[PDB]
Design an enzyme around this catalytic site. Structure first.
Site, short mmCIF file in Angstrom:
data_model
loop_
_atom_site.label_atom_id
_atom_site.label_comp_id
_atom_site.label_asym_id
_atom_site.label_seq_id
_atom_site.Cartn_x
_atom_site.Cartn_y
_atom_site.Cartn_z
N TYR A 81 28.53 75.53 37.41
CA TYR A 81 28.29 74.15 36.97
C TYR A 81 27.93 73.16 38.06
O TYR A 81 27.20 72.21 37.82
CB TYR A 81 29.48 73.61 36.21
CG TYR A 81 29.68 74.12 34.81
CD1 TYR A 81 29.01 75.23 34.29
CD2 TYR A 81 30.61 73.48 34.01
CE1 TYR A 81 29.29 75.67 32.99
CE2 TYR A 81 30.87 73.88 32.75
CZ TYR A 81 30.24 74.96 32.25
OH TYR A 81 30.59 75.30 30.95
N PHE A 113 36.37 30.70 41.79
CA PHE A 113 37.04 31.41 42.89
C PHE A 113 37.64 32.74 42.41
O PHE A 113 38.09 33.54 43.22
CB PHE A 113 38.14 30.54 43.52
CG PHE A 113 39.01 29.86 42.49
CD1 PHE A 113 39.90 30.59 41.74
CD2 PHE A 113 38.86 28.53 42.22
CE1 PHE A 113 40.68 29.96 40.74
CE2 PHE A 113 39.61 27.91 41.24
CZ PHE A 113 40.53 28.63 40.51
N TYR A 117 35.59 5.33 42.35
CA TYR A 117 36.76 5.75 41.56
C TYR A 117 37.85 6.41 42.42
O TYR A 117 37.62 6.73 43.59
CB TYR A 117 36.34 6.69 40.42
CG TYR A 117 37.03 6.42 39.10
CD1 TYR A 117 36.91 5.18 38.46
CD2 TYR A 117 37.81 7.40 38.47
CE1 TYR A 117 37.53 4.92 37.25
CE2 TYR A 117 38.44 7.15 37.25
CZ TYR A 117 38.30 5.91 36.65
OH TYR A 117 38.92 5.66 35.44
#
Lengths: 689, 689
Positions: free
Chosen positions: A324, A373, A86
């Protein structure tokens, strides 16, 4: 059933983060990276990215050859059109020259126009050699699955470049994620005139010289249809660097957990902040693990040998709770570990993906066009990871800040000053300023990259991932975190040594105060000065309560707390002494001046002798770190690396000792002592039933 | 010669920033805003933007009419083509229906398609009424110069909407800078079916009802060629809001300068940080002005009545220097004032520009196509201003933080606690947490808007300013700065009151210690207990040195510093008393218990009485703020607004008193007392020769 693959993804996040890291480290150290297209890990990428003579080699699985050949053959057969198969596979314009009676002109053109990067002079605009190697490895791996239509021989050539450490020069910038930089790998393979590589010692090589040094079994490749696209279309540059970054990030996250515990040890924090009930009741797994790790360290700590309120050794903090950065460290670190772990799995999927277009599906006999991609997983994972690195850095800054502040550090010297004369020893003050600078820059770096997408390439790329740009920023963030981690670790080892000095000098002060009180507080008319017994024990209680470092540089100074509080005790006993106080021979008040004179004559020399004993390796009381689970890290920094205690009595600067740890850290030498701190842990919290 | 207009721009930045602000305020208060196209100031925009019943009206200069008519006539004559004049002016497609034998169809279409905004329900997606009014005013002003080709009658109609406070509803979003929102002004003027306005009390009006309430001298306009574009093409929405923002920003910058000085007063900072030599030697004018302003306040301060080391009232800080938020405040604020000032001039140029396209140049007999709709000056000035607002906020947070920390605030109570029992008064602790929250959000808002430009409108608008979006973010930043300024100002007034309490209670303690020492430290066999004289004066020195707030809640407690240090003084005098100490009748040691018992019986009630006296408006010593240049601000907050001293002995919360100041601030009531603090300043620093 798991038709959309959420199940397999979920399964990859079972088991502890620590066991994952252990596995990562073991994989990193393997001598051979065998690529098959589907089992590449960030640890393998990190191992290969190294240019440090570890001897690691890459091997390609022969089992992948058939599928690679099938798609490369398919493309070549597909070019034969009309009276054969093709039209034409698909490059990006069906019309032109592609190996029929032509000669692969389109592939030559592809690499030429993609060579649009700028290096200039020097290295500032060139991708690091480590990162190029990472990209090469990922690039090979993501072509091995057989859907890309490239010859196996090209994969074999890139493998030789890796094994012989011959590295193409790639531009640092030019990609929105990785056509431009990847085209410089392709240009080496095709012997483009501008292509350059670097050898193992930094020598610049022509493509000819590179092929010869690498052992490439052939001359320059002439790319076939689809081969140029196969080489340049991947997300390998962004994902290769992301892999490197996440290998470091995973390790530094464990270091941050363990340092949080060592911090708690030297601070005399209340260990109940790690109680499993607390963390169980929030359900978050990163927090539960972080707490269980810290708990493991504290449970085997000789410092957590604590005397409570009205303290003698280490207290809890009931009044004025721990701050803390100590007590919320598991809550703080947990989500960062979770993000680092999730990001790791995203990148591990990416580096085993087929990131190519079109895909050559031989089974269906067609090319499948799509968007693999598009490196969104890289951009997103790297933005999210960078934010987490910044948070880890912020906690380290806060912990460091507490550690060097005498108002917050439960008796340690301001600045962790080490020497006899505090007015000539400002300790870690410069390092503390540097720590702010590191933290501030990290917080700037925490901003995202992926919200700056331009509509690109004549508006064809109207979304694009920015994956490599993000990887690069996350890499910069990790380097700053290593500066912070280095500085903090050396600070922690200093504090360990100061606690050893503290216990020893306190013992000497008690001994001396005892001797003097015994001599002075009995004299009378006939010995037994009634009273003297309760007075001596209370004077010693003063010593036990008072912070050594508040007075030990001038222990008999009138304006320092030892002399003041000892006098206060004598006065208090005199006021309670009743009628005996009114007889000069049994008066406690009348012995104050004598007590003080005799203490002043003896105590300085006794303190100096004890100190010298300690400095010679013969302290009265051994350094308690030797009996702690955290000892392997202290031993590594202090003994193995020769990092010395910092003092204004010597010429050596903090930076000089930071270099030792930073250089070791960048070579991976901290990994073993870190993990050794936890090697007895069974992976579960202590029971709370 | 000044051919490029840099000279005129430079001249606009001469003279002090303070004199600029004074002028701004005076302009704001004028009853009439007269528009001529060239003299619009941010103060006029701010005055008109108000919907508060000030009565300010807008008037259009008749001198502008001729030029406006000339270009509107020109466009109408230009439509007559071929056998008259030429083709057609220029809308955006020469072909269609524009008032010949047609009927202005293109102008109807323009406004229809630009009505692409979304309001939804409620107000969350609607532009504030204030900001719409600002936009209307600027829009009129930038059409008065005569280059826009619009009928004067349309300008007269928008003027009526302003004067009668009938305000078209505009969407909050939809512009990249201002076609979409401005098309909703046009749609009101043309009676579009979806057009809405709001009346002075918030009633929703149809265009018909709006015209009738506003007194528009006509029915709906049928737009002529160029009129639709003239209405919609401007930068008026972005620049109108920028003007509002910068009016506030200028005032808040002066407030920050003055608060920095009041902070220094209550902190007992060393005033030499404002010495003009320091600031002269850096050359930066914002810093020199800021320092000279602070210097002015401190030079007329009754607090800067300071007793030096071994202090009795206010000390310098020689050992342990003042911290950076105090001593570097001029260096910090200066560049922020410079940016606010430069930004103000950018916006003042913008709101007097012709922001239209094409321009109708009657003198040259042509339309001139260009890009004046590109609102870059708005985007840039608003991004830069927002960064400066964030910096002002950060300094306020740092100053506030010092002020409420007993380790840094030179004797003030932790949290600026006000009541008799500190265990039931945590003062400003909640406010302090709120201040962190304000500061953090401000730092997020500091990020730019103008680096997020999309290639827009089929890539015609491939750069665009984002001016309104930026103005909106800067507006949000200014509101947070007002929350911070409110909270800090109330804190400063609390600290003023605590200093008044401190001086009064210290006086009472001295008086009582004096009385008791006199009674107890002479008794002997026959009066004169040798010694007693030097002992009394040293006991008083203890009181002068010690921080009242470290003991006054329980002054005779054994574990608080007053009892301890007083005892220490007695003991020190006894040890120096020689042979007199050994006789019971002349012994100082033997009077300690008596001294302490007699002090315990008298001092609590004396302290309580003094305090009650002070609370009733009859303190022994007047509040020194009454003799300070900063008094007008304290008086305003405390007396005029009724903001009360905060205490855990009462039910009132800090937020309740913050409301008073915030609401006053948002009504402009702080302007007069602020400027009154500086009204005696001659605009120069104190000499340093």
């Amino acid at each position: 059933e798991d038709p959309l693959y959420w199940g397999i993804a979920a399964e990859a996040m079972t088991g502890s983060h620590l066991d994952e890291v252990k596995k990562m480290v073991a994989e990193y150290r393997k001598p051979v990276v065998k690529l098959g297209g589907e089992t590449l890990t960030i640890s393998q990428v990190a191992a290969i990215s190294a240019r440090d003579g570890s001897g690691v080699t890459v091997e390609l699985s022969e089992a992948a050859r058939a599928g690679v050949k099938a798609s490369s053959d398919w493309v070549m057969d597909s070019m034969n059109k009309g009276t054969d198969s093709y039209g034409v596979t698909t490059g990006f314009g069906a019309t032109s020259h592609r190996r029929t009676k032509q000669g692969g002109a389109l592939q030559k053109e592809l690499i030429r126009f993609l060579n649009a990067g700028i290096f200039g002079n020097g290295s500032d605009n060139t991708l690091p050699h480590s990162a190029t190697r990472a990209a090469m490895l990922v690039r090979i791996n993501t072509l091995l699955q057989g859907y890309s239509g490239i010859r196996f021989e090209i994969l074999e050539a890139i493998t030789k470049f890796l094994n012989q450490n011959i590295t193409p020069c790639l531009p640092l910038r030019g990609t929105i994620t990785d056509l431009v930089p990847l085209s410089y790998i392709a240009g080496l393979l095709t012997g483009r005139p501008n292509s350059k590589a670097v050898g193992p010692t930094g020598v610049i090589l022509s493509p000819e010289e590179a092929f010869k040094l690498a052992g490439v079994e052939g001359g320059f490749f002439e790319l076939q249809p689809k081969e140029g696209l196969a080489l340049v279309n991947g997300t390998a540059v962004g994902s290769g660097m992301a892999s490197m970054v996440l290998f470091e990030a995973n390790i530094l996250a464990v270091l941050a957990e363990v340092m949080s515990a060592i911090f708690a040890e030297v601070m005399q924090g209340k260990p109940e902040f790690t109680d499993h009930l607390t963390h169980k009741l929030k359900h978050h797994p990163g927090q539960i693990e972080a707490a269980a790790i810290m708990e493991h360290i504290l449970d085997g700590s000789a410092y957590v040998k604590a005397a409570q309120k009205l303290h003698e050794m280490d207290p809890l903090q009931k009044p004025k709770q721990d701050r803390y950065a100590l007590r919320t460290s598991p809550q703080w670190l947990g989500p960062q570990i979770e993000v680092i772990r999730s990001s790791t799995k995203m990148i591990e999927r990416e580096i085993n993906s087929v990131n190519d277009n079109p895909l050559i599906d031989v089974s269906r006999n067609k090319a499948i066009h799509g968007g693999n991609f598009q490196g969104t997983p890289i951009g997103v994972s790297m933005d999210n990871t960078r934010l987490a690195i910044a948070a880890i850095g912020k906690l380290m800054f806060a912990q460091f800040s507490e550690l060097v502040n005498d108002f917050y550090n439960n008796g340690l010297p301001s600045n962790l000053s080490g020497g006899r004369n505090p007015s000539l020893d400002y300790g870690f003050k410069g390092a503390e300023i540097a720590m702010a600078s590191y933290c501030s820059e990290l917080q700037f770096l925490a901003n995202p990259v992926t919200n700056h997408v331009q509509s690109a390439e004549q508006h064809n790329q109207d979304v694009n991932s920015l994956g490599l740009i993000s990887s690069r920023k996350t890499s910069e963030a990790v380097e700053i975190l290593k500066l912070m981690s280095t500085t903090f670790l050396v600070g922690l080892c200093q504090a360990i040594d100061l606690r050893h000095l503290e216990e020893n000098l306190k013992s000497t002060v008690k001994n001396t105060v005892s001797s003097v009180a015994k001599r002075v507080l009995t004299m009378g008319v006939n010995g037994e000065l009634h009273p003297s017994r309760f007075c001596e024990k209370d004077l010693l209680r003063v010593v036990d309560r008072e912070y050594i470092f508040a007075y030990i540089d001038d222990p008999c100074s009138a304006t320092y707390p030892l002399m003041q509080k000892l006098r206060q005790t004598l006065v208090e006993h005199a006021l309670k002494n009743g009628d005996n106080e009114r007889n000069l021979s049994t008066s406690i008040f009348q012995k104050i001046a004598t007590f003080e004179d005799e203490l002043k004559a003896l105590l300085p020399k006794e303190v100096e002798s004890a100190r010298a004993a300690l400095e010679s390796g013969n302290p009265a009381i051994p350094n308690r770190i030797e009996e702690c689970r955290s000892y392997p890290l202290y031993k590594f920094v202090r003994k193995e690396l020769g990092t010395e205690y910092l003092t204004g009595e010597k010429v050596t600067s903090p930076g000089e000792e930071f270099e030792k740890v930073f250089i070791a850290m960048s070579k991976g030498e901290i990994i073993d002592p870190l993990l050794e701190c936890l090697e007895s842990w069974n992976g579960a919290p202590l029971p709370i039933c």
